[PDB]
Every structure is written in structure tokens, then in C-alpha cells.
Amino acid sequence: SAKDGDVEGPAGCKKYDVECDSGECCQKQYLWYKWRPLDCRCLKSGFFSSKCVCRDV
């Protein structure tokens, strides 16, 4: 069985809520008890300096 933090791809890749290059995220990640893809989205929530990180897509 898989748990939170579990991802798919090469060892040492990126994870949920993490910066990356070329806006490319790991293969997949166990989110909400479901393996979904990741995308480096750039959005801010009432913050001053927005940031780009991987998110469920």
C-alpha cells in the first residue's frame, strides 16, 4: 500500500508543493489516496511574493 509523500519516477525528483525546472513535476504522487500528476503552477494566496510549485492537475 502507498502513503502520503509517495511519488513515481527517478529517485530524487520533485514532490507536491516544491519548485522545479521547466515547470516539470514528477511523474505522479499519491494525493488524496489517489495517484495524480503534478504541475508547477504559479499562484499566490493573499501573499506578497508569489511562488511556483507543483500541484495536483
Swiss-Prot record:
What family is this protein classified in? Belongs to the neurotoxin 26 (DTX) family.
Query: Reported effect of changing residue 48 to A?
Result: Severe decrease of activation of B.germanica sodium channel
Its annotated function is as follows:
Insecticidal toxin. This toxin promotes opening of insect Nav channels. The toxin binds to the S1-S2 and S3-S4 loops in the domain II voltage-sensor of insect Nav channels (i.e., receptor site 4). The American cockroach P.americana is largely resistant to the effects of this toxin due to an unusual sequence within the domain II S1-S2 loop. In vivo, paralyzes lepidopteran and dipteran larvae. Paralyzed insects ultimately die from secondary effects of starvation and dehydration.
Outcome of mutating residue 41 to A: Almost complete loss of activation of B.germanica sodium channel
Gene Ontology terms for molecular function: sodium channel regulator activity; toxin activity
Q: Where is this site: Interacts with insect Nav channel?
A: 21, 33, 41, 44, 48-49, 56
In the UniProt record, does the keyword NADP occur?
no
**What happens upon changing residue 56 to A?**
Almost complete loss of activation of B.germanica sodium channel
Coarsely, its chief localization is secreted
Extra info from the record? Negative results: has no effect on the human Nav channel subtypes Nav1.1-Nav1.7, and no effect on hERG (Kv11.1) and Kv2.1. Is non-toxic to mice at 657 pmol/g (4.2 mg/kg) i.p. and 156 pmol/g (1.0 mg/kg) i.c.v.
List localization entries.
Secreted
> Has UniProt tagged this entry with the keyword Disulfide bond?
yes
Protein name, per record? Beta-diguetoxin-Dc1a
**According to the UniProt record, which cysteines are disulfide-bonded?**
13-26, 20-40, 25-54, 42-52
User: What does the record say about tissue specificity?
Assistant: Expressed by the venom gland.
Q: Which GO terms describe its cellular component?
A: extracellular region; host cell presynaptic membrane
Mutagenesis / variant outcome for changing residue 33 to A: Almost complete loss of activation of B.germanica sodium channel
- Identify the keywords attached in UniProt to this record, alphabetized: Disulfide bond, Ion channel impairing toxin, Knottin, Neurotoxin, Presynaptic neurotoxin, Secreted, Signal, Toxin, Voltage-gated sodium channel impairing toxin
